[PDB]
Amino acid sequence: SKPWNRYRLPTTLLPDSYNVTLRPYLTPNADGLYIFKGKSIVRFLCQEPTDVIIIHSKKLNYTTQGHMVVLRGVGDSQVPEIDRTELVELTEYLVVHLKGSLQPGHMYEMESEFQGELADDLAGFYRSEYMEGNVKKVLATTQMQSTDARKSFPCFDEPAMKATFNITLIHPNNLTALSNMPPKGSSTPLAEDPNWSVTEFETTPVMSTYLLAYIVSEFQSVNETAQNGVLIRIWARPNAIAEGHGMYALNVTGPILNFFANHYNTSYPLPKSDQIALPDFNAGAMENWGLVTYRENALLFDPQSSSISNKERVVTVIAHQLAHQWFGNLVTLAWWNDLWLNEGFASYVEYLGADHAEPTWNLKDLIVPGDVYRVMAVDALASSHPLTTPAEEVNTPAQISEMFDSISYSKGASVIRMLSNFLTEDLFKEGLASYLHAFAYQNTTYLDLWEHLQKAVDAQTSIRLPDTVRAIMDRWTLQMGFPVITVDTKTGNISQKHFLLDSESNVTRSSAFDYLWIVPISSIKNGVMQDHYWLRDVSQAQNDLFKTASDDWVLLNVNVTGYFQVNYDEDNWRMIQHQLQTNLSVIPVINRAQVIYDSFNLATAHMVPVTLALDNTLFLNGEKEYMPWQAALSSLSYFSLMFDRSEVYGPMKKYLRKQVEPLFQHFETLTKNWTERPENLMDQYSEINAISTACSNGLPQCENLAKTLFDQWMSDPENNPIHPNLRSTIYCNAIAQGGQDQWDFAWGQLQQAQLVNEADKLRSALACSNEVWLLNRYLGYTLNPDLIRKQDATSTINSIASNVIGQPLAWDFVQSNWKKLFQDYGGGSFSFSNLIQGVTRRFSSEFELQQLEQFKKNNMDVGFGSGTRALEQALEKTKANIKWVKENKEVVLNWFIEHSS
Amino acid sequence: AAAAAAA
Ligand SMILES: *[C@@H]1O[C@H](CO)[C@@H](O[C@@H]2O[C@H](CO)[C@@H](O)[C@H](O)[C@H]2NC(C)=O)[C@H](O)[C@H]1NC(C)=O
Ligand SMILES: *[C@@H]1O[C@H](CO)[C@@H](O[C@@H]2O[C@H](CO)[C@@H](O)[C@H](O)[C@H]2NC(C)=O)[C@H](O)[C@H]1NC(C)=O
Ligand SMILES: *[C@@H]1O[C@H](CO)[C@@H](O[C@@H]2O[C@H](CO)[C@@H](O)[C@H](O)[C@H]2NC(C)=O)[C@H](O)[C@H]1NC(C)=O
Ligand SMILES: *[C@@H]1O[C@H](CO)[C@@H](O[C@@H]2O[C@H](CO)[C@@H](O)[C@H](O)[C@H]2NC(C)=O)[C@H](O)[C@H]1NC(C)=O
Ligand SMILES: *[C@@H]1O[C@H](CO)[C@@H](O[C@@H]2O[C@H](CO)[C@@H](O)[C@H](O)[C@H]2NC(C)=O)[C@H](O)[C@H]1NC(C)=O
Ligand SMILES: *[C@@H]1O[C@H](CO)[C@@H](O)[C@H](O)[C@H]1NC(C)=O
Ligand SMILES: *[C@@H]1O[C@H](CO)[C@@H](O)[C@H](O)[C@H]1NC(C)=O
Ligand SMILES: *[C@@H]1O[C@H](CO)[C@@H](O)[C@H](O)[C@H]1NC(C)=O
Ligand SMILES: *[C@@H]1O[C@H](CO)[C@@H](O)[C@H](O)[C@H]1NC(C)=O
Ligand SMILES: *[C@@H]1O[C@H](CO)[C@@H](O)[C@H](O)[C@H]1NC(C)=O
Ligand SMILES: [Zn+2]
């Protein structure tokens, strides 16, 4: 085959350095087209003789004099004549056919002039539109991740083909130009038209194309100079900056950078750090080296209207991107098949960095609910996949995009955290530093990190492993899934097997290891840490560490550092339960949660009865801390979803009202009648969940608090008396208790809300009305652009659907208005998969299945488009719900009746 | 891009 028909670049030519000049035109032409122009020179070195230059180019028109490029030799090298230049669209190449061969060791310069659309598409150099007062503003910014650098200028657009870049922006003279590096100096006027200015930037270090960034805008900054002279700036809309919304980001950035320089034993490798808040940046955040982009709600924080979870989100998303400024940007994985190592690593250490900035918050705990249990839901499926993918199976831009998923990020994080824990952090940090120093400004595979970690292991005598780092990690990276570890405490027998939530699932993906792992197993016996154990690649083993007397108990996987779930014989479970009932503080808070998370998953898998899982919630009446309650609430939301229209609900509600009342009472006092929030994040999180659980389960005292506060707000609209933390519950419950007075007031507040996060809470709360007529009127608003944003339409319908009373109304609304398909799937794709998912979520009867089939019977024209697969998922999901409800209804009913007094 | 990773 011809090389220009292969998706991977040749290795015959390697880039040295680039000059790139970009010029966005932020005024459309007389047709509404926005464009940018560019000029580039790439200097590259011939490694092997070749008579063709293949470089990436996507959606660029060339206006170069002559052929699409001009080609020169560097110094006194001669250059062959160009035969022709062509664009090969499929593989996204510009191809320069030469009349002779380039010579090994010679350097060449290739110059081009080009232009592209400055589209509203979040790809390459693109435009972003937003409002300042009555004025529509347009800025130019970048998103190269993963294969879009080539959409802004021709380049060898693979991550290992690193080079230095000299960026120049030509821009309106009253706008600011930003790039990876500082400007060289002040801007100078463009001679052809001094309404434009030219900003040149300092040369980048040797770096990857996917990490380039350049931005032209009206933004302003808050700034700090670190003690080492590193300039730190947070950029945002002028009104956001003036409001002070960039201050929290500024506060944490300096401490995070310092943490990482030490953690990595490597100086921050750039002269400055810019971070920018972009309105409606749907990629969320991107780690461009020296110029990190964020969506506004991810970077900005308003103390007066934002909740604590909001603050947690800002500090961790910052730590994540900053983590990459070394791991990923300084040392770069050679190919997209190893993306998991890069994103998995940042997804783990974001908690470490953030913990440094907010050390009272215990942020490191949050990886357990946030990543470990989250990803275990999808990794406990037959349709999962290994972290590792052969490089030669990842070729196309679409294949590269598929690397960015939950497994890569969250299982990547879980597995790396497990690795650091079993090596110990000190030892892990030593291998990590060695890896970074050896490969700085270069590229690696995951085997390079293992090698450097093994070097650290081999240079000490304290930590001993049952095999090499690589052999151990191969079990966690070359095969999908994870084991359930089952202990029989009467014998100390211990077994492992591939855990699937569906006990009747057929696994057809084969493992080189037969789904056996090498497993690090910490344990606690009667509240005392035991010696660490390794389960080798065997189905069963035995150790006295896991053997108990019937007044003793043992509990494995302390703090859920290991990527596995744990089952015990029923006697040990009861002992654990007893301990949790009498003195819970003897079991680490994370394990108090684990008992709940694991047992509910085990019940789903038919490995324990559902009553055993429910039994594990009984201790919660004395539980004050966030996580174990969160575990219960996450595990029970499906029960609520299946049973909230059934006879099971009263007893469930009553049971939950019983469990949560003492916690509610506790915070009542602690908060001094809800006047002051608890001090640290976990306790604030616990209060939020307690209020939520209390109110939504009809605890009179909570309902009273909600009604009082909202009435107080209504009598004095400009002085909101509800703390941001509690708003979503208080607003929802108060609207639930009230009528059109409350609803119309909240709607008024929605229509004048300036801040997205307040508007979100209001939109969600309005769906909590218990008046059919208000909900139907609200549904009638969701398709009106004047009243509900397009981007918010399905979200709103979904919130209405989640109201038991709104369920039939939303479902009727969707069926009836479905012909908004030939209206929103040609103008703006309109997340239809989420809508179907949401409104059909509750379905658990044959009757509801029949409704869904009868509704589907409209394939005749219309179709479904983006949610065609989502409908099929809904039918499969309904069958699963039907079956689960039949198996569980009776047992669950009687357990709740039994335990609600 | 991205992460964090909620709970
Ligand atoms: C980008 O700018 C840098 C910095 O000015 C250029 O680096 C110079 O390049 C040549 C080698 O080709 C040397 O003679 C100089 O010593 C370099 N200077 C420095 C400070 O390193 C680089 O060539 C430019 N890139 C391109 C494509 O022109
Ligand atoms: C890439 O850009 C740099 C900066 O403009 C070029 O270097 C300059 O070249 C001009 C002449 O055109 C001289 O006046 C300066 O001495 C250079 N400036 C610096 C800072 O070195 C460089 O020639 C460009 N690279 C190529 C291959 O054209
Ligand atoms: C990287 O790590 C090394 C090793 O810890 C650091 O060097 C040590 O610094 C302390 C001073 O606080 C000395 O007491 C040790 O003797 C040093 N050890 C060695 C081998 O030099 C070093 O400072 C770190 N570098 C960076 C950039 O973080
Ligand atoms: C990708 O990374 C490897 C290193 O992992 C680079 O190879 C090294 O290049 C340096 C010079 O920069 C040499 O000192 C080493 O001896 C090389 N190691 C090898 C070849 O194993 C490689 O250059 C990078 N690939 C590209 C295209 O830049
Ligand atoms: C299990 O996790 C907890 C955190 O939830 C760890 O407890 C923390 O440990 C460090 C140092 O001992 C302290 O800075 C924290 O204040 C501790 N918090 C509490 C509540 O004790 C605990 O050390 C972990 N256990 C293991 C074996 O790693
Ligand atoms: C690129 O060229 C095609 C016609 O060859 C044209 O339709 C398109 O508008 C051009 N785009 C730009 C941004 O100049
Ligand atoms: C920049 O100049 C243009 C054209 O006069 C104007 O529309 C815009 O508001 C100015 N912006 C700033 C930040 O001064
Ligand atoms: C930033 O830091 C200052 C100094 O500690 C503090 O008073 C302020 O509350 C912080 N800003 C935010 C939004 O947290
Ligand atoms: C425990 O393991 C041993 C070792 O093979 C086996 O003989 C025994 O039957 C096992 N007992 C139980 C109760 O699992
Ligand atoms: C509970 O256990 C902890 C740890 O052993 C101990 O400090 C505390 O005194 C115990 N409290 C009670 C009421 O037994
Ligand atoms: Zn990331």
Q: Quick check: A284 and B1 CB within 8 A?
A: yes
Q: Which two tokens stand for residue A893?
A: 């009913």
For chain B, give me the number of helices (H) and strands (E)? 0, 0
Using an 8 Å Cβ cutoff, are A783 and A827 in contact?
no
Distance CA(A329)–CA(A323), nearest Å, equals 9
Q: Assess contact for A126 and A116: CB atoms under 8 A.
A: no
Residue A235 near residue A335, CB atoms below 8 Å: no
Q: Does domain A569-901 have CATH number 1.25.50.20?
A: yes
Distance CA A443, CA A830 (A): 39
Residue with tokens 């994870």: A482
Quick check: helix, strand or coil at residue A355?
helix
Q: Which of A92, A65, A71 is nearest to A83 (CA)?
A: A71
CA dihedral A395, A398, A404, A406 (to 10 degrees): -110
Is 1.10.760.10 the CATH number for A482-568? no
A669 exposure class (CB count in 10 Å sphere: 0-12, 13-18, 19+): exposed
Nearest Cα residue in chain A from B2: A285
Within 8 A by CB and 6+ apart from A857, the residues are: none
- Structural determination approach: X-ray
Work out the minimum CA distance from A284 to partner chain B, whole angstroms: 6
Which residues, 6 or more positions from A854, have their beta carbon under 8 angstroms from its beta carbon?
none
Cα separation, A345 vs A325, whole angstroms: 12
Q: Could you say which ligand is closest to the alpha carbon of residue A18? A: 1
- Measuring from atom 1 of ligand 10, which residue has the nearest CA? A583
Count CB neighbours of A605 within 10 A.
19
Name the CATH architecture for the domain at A220-481: Orthogonal Bundle (1.10)
**Interface A:B, Cβ pairs < 8 A:** 48
Q: Fold identical between A220-481 and A569-901?
A: no
Record the resolution, in angstroms: 2.1
What are the extents of the domains in chain A? 1-219, 220-481, 482-568, 569-901
Amino acid, res. A116: G
Cα gap A139→A26, rounded to integer Å:
7
DSSP lists the bridge partners of residue A842 as none
CA-closest candidate to residue A328, choices A480, A201, A446: A446
CA–CA distance, A7 with A395 (Å, rounded to integer)? 6
The answer to whether the peptide bond before residue A637 is cis (omega within 30 degrees of 0) is no
* Nearest of A182, A216, A440, A181 to residue A288 by alpha carbon: A181
Query: Which residue from A154, A176, A272, A263 is spatially nearest to A223, judged by alpha carbons?
Result: A272
Q: Where are any strands of DSSP class E within A323-476?
A: 331-333, 442-444
Whole-angstrom distance, CA of residue A707 vs CA of residue A711: 6
Task: Give the integer Cα–Cα distance in Å for A595 and A66.
Answer: 71
Q: State how far Cα A738 lies from the chain centre.
A: 37
Task: Measure the CA–CA gap between A337 and A175, rounded to whole angstroms.
Answer: 39
Find the helix packing angle between A589-604 and A626-643, rounded to 10°.
20
Ligand 8 atom at minimal distance to the Cα of residue A311: 14
What is the rounded distance in angstroms from the CA atom of residue A191 to the CA atom of residue A201?
A: 19
DSSP state of A370: I
Ligand closest in space to the Cα of A133: 7
The DSSP bridge pattern shows strands A196-200 and A164-172 to be antiparallel
Determine whether the shortest distance from the Cβ of A195 to ligand 7 is under 6 A: no
Three-state SS annotation for A201-222 = ECCCCCECHHHCCEEEECCEEE
Contacts of A446 (CB under 8 A, 6+ apart): A333, A338, A341, A388, A477
Q: Which CATH fold topology does A1-219 show?
A: Immunoglobulin-like (2.60.40)
Is residue A623 less than 8 Å (CB to CB) from chain B? no
In 10 A of CB A282, how many CB atoms?
9
CA-wise closest residue to A608 among A639, A638, A566: A566
Find tokens 């744990």 and name the residue.
A566
In B, residues 1-7, which contact A (CB 8 Å cutoff)?
Answer: 1-7
Q: Could you tell me if the CB of A218 is within 6 A of ligand 7?
A: yes
